[PDB]
Each structure stands twice: as structure tokens, then as C-alpha cells.
Design a protein around this ligand. Structure first.
Ligand SMILES: [Ca+2]
Length: 236
């Protein structure tokens, strides 16, 4: 996350850290959201390889055993049938992970609230991106979870030629476009939007400009969660 600040520990209880094994170590690579006790929602580009996964719930400081984490393994990965890794701009960047066991819900570990099917956010809806990703383009990952004010940008603006143009589809949500942005390592994580006083997960971080993470007029692009409610229900 570029800009913003370190979040208060465990203040976004559905945020998860997706890590892969390499030798004796596990490395954080993507974020995600706990949507059911045994199910995680993340980006397809995070799990379209055969890696040994570790899902960490209730996480804050990646390098410390704080006592509130729940370490989980992945039983099965479901990638959207329309996903094409060769063309991230085509959309369908979403995947579900069936965990081997179910989480124990508590103050540090809770389920995300998903939006009604096809719900569209009005322009400038207050939202926050969360994650352990790079703190600047080419910069280091953040040991602690960060958050950054990242209000929604409607499709009309986002798809205008001065912004993302035709790269953004209606099945995507844009947010930011300024100094704050997601960055490498934030992929798969949530775009938490306040609707009617509550936080709902409206997006799954998908991509940013190739020039730089927080490139001017290049808002972070998210898979629009509301467009995939029926697909998810068909799987779970
Ligand atoms: Ca920790």
C-alpha cells in the first residue's frame, strides 16, 4: 500500500495473508478476504500456479507470532473459468480457496460482508484498501498491515481516455487515482467500502499502472465483487 498508514492491529478482521512455501520459509505474496469459515476470496493471478500455500488469519505483523493468528492450509483452489493470465485487463481476476479446516471466529477473525449482486457504488464512495504490499513502486513490503483512504471512481471517469480508457471493464471497480494506491503484494486483498454505515468488500485488488503503482490518473483497479456473487454461490 502506497501512502496511507499502518492500521491499528486487527482492525480489518477479514483480511488474510496468502503465503507460499520456499524451502523452510513462507513468503507473503497476496492478500485476500475471509468470506465463510472455510472459504477465502482472492485474485486468480495469485493462485494460478501450483504452489504450497499458507493462509494466515488474524494477522498484523508478518514476522512475529502475536498470538491472534490462525494458520490454515488450502484444500482446493477454484479459479474463474473466464480468467486469462495473459490478459489481466480482460477481467475475471477472482478465485476461491477452500481451506482444510474452518476458522474460529472471534474479535480478531471475522467474515467479510459481501455486497448484493450487481450493486454499483456511487462516485467518490468512501473506501479503504488494506494490505502488506510494497510501500512504493519497487519499494519494500510492509511488515505491518497498512490501510489507505482510496475513494471509488465511477466507471464513466475511470474509462475516460485520460484515465484507464478501454482497459477497465464494467466488471471492475476503480479507486484512487492519486498519491494513494495498492502496489505489489496487495493483489487479491479487499477494497473495503462503507455503505450505510457498514464495511463491505467491493473489490479484489487486481492491477495498477505498469509505469508506477500510484501513477497519476491510474487508479488501482479491482475485480468488482458484486459481479460474481452468483458464480461464488454456485461454487460454495
Ligand atoms: Ca504476526
Amino acid at each position: 500500500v502506497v501512502g496511507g498508514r499502518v492500521a491499528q492491529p486487527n482492525s480489518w478482521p477479514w483480511q488474510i495473508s496468502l503465503q507460499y512455501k520456499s524451502g523452510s520459509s513462507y513468503y507473503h505474496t497476496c492478500g485476500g478476504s475471509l468470506i465463510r469459515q472455510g472459504w477465502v476470496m482472492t485474485a486468480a493471478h495469485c493462485v494460478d500456479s501450483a504452489r504450497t500455500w499458507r493462509v494466515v488469519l488474524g494477522e498484523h505483523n508478518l514476522n512475529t507470532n502475536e498470538g491472534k493468528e490462525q494458520i490454515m492450509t488450502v484444500n482446493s483452489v477454484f479459479i474463474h473459468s473466464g480468467w486469462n493470465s495473459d490478459d489481466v485487463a480482460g477481467g475475471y481476476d477472482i478465485a476461491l480457496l477452500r481451506l482444510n479446516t474452518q476458522a474460529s471466529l472471534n474479535s480478531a477473525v471475522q467474515l467479510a460482508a459481501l455486497p448484493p449482486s450487481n450493486q454499483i457504488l456511487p462516485n467518490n464512495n468512501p473506501c479503504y484498501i488494506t494490505g502488506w504490499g510494497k510501500t512504493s513502486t519497487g519499494g519494500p513490503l510492509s511488515d505491518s498491515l497498512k490501510q489507505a483512504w482510496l475513494p471509488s471512481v465511477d466507471h464513466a471517469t475511470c474509462s475516460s481516455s485520460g484515465w484507464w480508457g478501454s482497459t477497465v471493464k464494467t466488471t471492475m471497480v476503480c479507486a484512487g487515482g492519486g498519491a494513494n494506491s495498492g502496489c505489489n503484494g496487495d493483489s487479491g486483498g479487499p477494497l473495503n467500502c462503507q455503505v450505510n454505515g457498514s464495511y463491505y468488500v467491493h473489490g479484489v485488488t487486481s492491477f495498477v499502472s505498469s509505469s508506477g503503482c500510484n501513477a497519476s490518473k491510474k487508479p488501482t483497479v479491482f475485480t468488482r465483487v458484486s459481479a460474481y456473487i452468483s458464480w461464488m454461490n454456485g461454487i460454495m
